[PDB]
Design a protein around this ligand. Structure first.
Ligand SMILES: O=C(O)c1cc(C(=O)O)c2c(n1)C(=O)C(=O)c1cc(C(=O)O)[nH]c1-2
Ligand SMILES: [Pr+3]
Length: 562
């Protein structure tokens, strides 16, 4: 019972959230203001739901809520339907996963999509699955790609113009990134668009694949030899959609392998934002945040549409806080650079951006080629490869006009080494040790003014931040910490105003909605993601943080709202 018009209305309908991002553009802003700075002290848990299964690790889903039912995912490719008022389980789906799944960075999943009477998600063995919303039974399932080649799916899918769209993950395994659209009712493939230059995209008619242009025009333009055949650029975070331009905005992963000396050239369209026509999957513009990446600065971070006025002129902008440390503002009609500026305190790999938004590189900050030695020169780089920001989404508050960015301050030793591609094996060619830049903190929640290019406030956290952000009309900003708290801040000042210890690190993007005249807030908890196994010295800071796997639901009682 979810229509396309309903999806386009988010977040206008107080009783439901039927999109990842609280609206197709991903602003993560709720217009609800029952809960505000003056009464958030009365917010308290009303029920919780354990995922069980002795299957914990990272829990990254944002729940969707429709007809009083919450739909969410868990680690290890599970889907739950849970009564929003009581926490009672309606049904649960556990995907059968093979023992040789190949996620780089934990067995995470970022959520479902809803359309008609179906619930959709992608699995860690790279299937797209449609479940009956009432029974949880499989209605259809399609292989998106071959998990034995290193493909997985970790992102929430999206609905655009009645089409179900998913990317894939696996750049650390040298997969070929691609975005796919499907008929939601039956799983019939509609189009496919590779994100690596040189690969043919297709539309599908009557079950037949019809050529629809090579991504980037021709193979070998910004890649040498056949390196583009394992180029990565996986669009592993999903994307968002702008109704005004009718463009899907999708970011792409790092180029493979990590050893950039094996792939001279800009390596399109790795570490880029793409705008695609949803009719047929053609790329209408691109912006490359890190050309010829040498640091695993994936360019997937969400590109969030927002409008403002400059010289009395209306600007259709979009903002993204990149892995590489720069906060970019683009003209979303054509992809042209408006402004870009650091949102972390230390960047070594570039000294700035040129007039088109291309980095001005500091070549001493790229690890050298191994040459005659086993390893090349080690260099210290900031940000670390895990990024100034990683998967976890920022939020836009329409009232303050600010973006609220969960950022991290860390650097890395990094070196390069030879690497031969082997199907299904890691495809790095680099070694590394992530290190803190500061003794007392790593994570920094930052309010960014995207028009002035200024930081408005900052809040430091001992552990890295690794969770999505929510902001509301009640002048509130919510986000989780690995220390286990769901935390709320004053959106104007950054002062903490509320928190609750959920008992395991909180990664989920919080969501809020209204039922029976009361405002609810929900988040999933369960520590994991890339930091424990990729985090180097910083992982040691959080080594004693226990796993979990639980949906938490809070409410402001009606009689305490005034
Ligand atoms: O290049 C890729 O295809 C890909 C996928 C993922 C993923 O699917 O989650 C991550 C990364 N890269 C990555 O570079 C990274 O730091 C990362 C962190 C996480 C996480 O969920 O904590 N996933 C990923
Ligand atoms: Pr990557």
């Amino acid at each position: 019972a979810v229509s396309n018009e309903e999806i386009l209305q988010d977040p206008k309908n107080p009783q439901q959230i039927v999109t990842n991002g609280l609206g197709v553009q991903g602003q993560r802003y709720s217009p609800l203001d029952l809960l505000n700075v003056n009464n958030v002290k009365e917010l308290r848990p009303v029920w919780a739901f354990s995922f069980g299964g002795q299957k914990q690790r990272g829990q990254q889903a944002q729940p969707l809520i429709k007809d009083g039912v919450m739909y969410l995912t868990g680690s290890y490719s599970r889907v739950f339907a849970v009564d929003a008022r009581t926490g009672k389980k309606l049904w649960q789906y556990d995907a059968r996963l093979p023992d040789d799944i190949r996620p780089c960075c934990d067995v995470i999943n970022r959520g479902v999509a809803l359309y008609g009477n179906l619930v959709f998600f992608g699995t860690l063995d790279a299937k797209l699955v449609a479940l009956n919303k009432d029974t949880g039974k499989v209605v259809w399932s399609k292989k998106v790609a071959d998990h034995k080649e290193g493909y997985s799916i970790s992102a929430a899918p999206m609905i655009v113009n009645g089409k179900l769209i998913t990317g894939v993950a696996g750049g650390e395994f040298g997969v070929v990134g691609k975005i796919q659209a499907y008929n939601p009712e039956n799983g019939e493939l509609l189009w496919m668009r590779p994100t690596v230059e040189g690969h043919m995209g297709y539309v599908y008619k009557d079950g037949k694949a019809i050529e629809n242009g090579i991504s980037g025009g021709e193979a070998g333009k910004t890649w040498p030899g056949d390196l583009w055949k394992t180029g990565g650029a996986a669009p592993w975070l999903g994307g968002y959609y702008d109704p005004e331009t009718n463009l899907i905005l999708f970011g792409t992963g790092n180029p493979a392998p990590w050893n950039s000396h094996l792939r001279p050239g800009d390596n399109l369209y790795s570490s880029s934002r793409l705008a695609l026509n949803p009719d047929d999957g053609t790329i209408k513009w691109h912006f490359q945040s890190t050309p010829h990446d040498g640091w695993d600065f994936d360019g997937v971070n969400e590109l969030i549409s927002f409008n403002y006025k400059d010289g009395g002129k209306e600007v259709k902008a979009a903002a993204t806080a990149d892995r590489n440390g720069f906060f970019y503002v683009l003209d979303r009609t054509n992809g042209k650079f408006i402004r870009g500026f650091p949102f972390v305190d230390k960047i070594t790999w570039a000294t700035g951006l040129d007039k088109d938004g291309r980095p001005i590189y500091n070549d001493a900050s790229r690890p050298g080629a191994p040459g005659s030695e086993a390893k090349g020169s080690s260099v210290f780089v900031a940000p670390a490869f895990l990024g100034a920001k990683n998967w976890m989404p920022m939020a836009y508050n329409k009232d303050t006009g600010l973006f609220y960015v969960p950022s991290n301050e860390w650097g890395m030793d990094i070196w390069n080494e030879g690497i031969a591609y082997k199907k299904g094996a890691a495809f790095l060619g680099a070694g590394f040790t992530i290190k803190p830049l500061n003794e007392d903190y790593i994570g920094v929640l930052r309010a960014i003014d995207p028009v002035s290019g200024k930081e408005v406030w900052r809040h430091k956290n001992y552990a890295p931040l690794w969770g999505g952000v929510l902001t509301t009309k009640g002048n509130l900003v919510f986000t989780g910490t690995p220390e286990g708290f769901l935390q709320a801040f004053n959106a104007k000042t950054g002062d903490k105003v509320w928190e609750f210890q959920t008992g395991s690190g909180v990664l989920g993007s919080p969501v809020t909605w209204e039922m029976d005249g009361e405002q609810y807030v929900s988040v999933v908890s369960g520590w994991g993601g890339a930091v424990p196994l990729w985090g180097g010295e910083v992982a040691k800071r959080v080594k004693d943080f226990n796993q979990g796997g639980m949906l938490w639901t809070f409410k402001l009682p009606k009689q305490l709202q005034q």
